From a paper:
Collagen-like peptides have been utilized as a molecular platform to investigate side chain interactions. The characteristic structure of a collagen-like peptide is a triple helix composed of three chains. Each chain adopts a well-extended PPII conformation with successive Gly-X-Y triplets. Chain trimerization is induced by inter-chain backbone hydrogen bonding between Gly and non-Gly residues.
Numbering used by the authors:
A (entry chain B), B (entry chain C), C (entry chain A): 25 to 47, 50
């Protein structure tokens, strides 16, 4: 019959990259 | 009937860690 | 039909903040 509803939201993305070096 | 469309992309990941200490 | 498959992984998190101040 008709296609089901859309699936659930995917997994959370990966953690962000490290920030840059601090100020001098 | 068939499985529905793929779900939405997941939530964004958490922010990355603080960068290393600044250069001298 | 049944609900669709899970969505893709979300976007990567934002970059971290700048690191601690460096030595003098």
């Amino acid at each position: 019959g008709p296609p089901g509803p859309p699936g659930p939201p995917g997994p959370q993305g990966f953690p962000g990259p490290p920030g840059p070096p601090g100020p001098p």
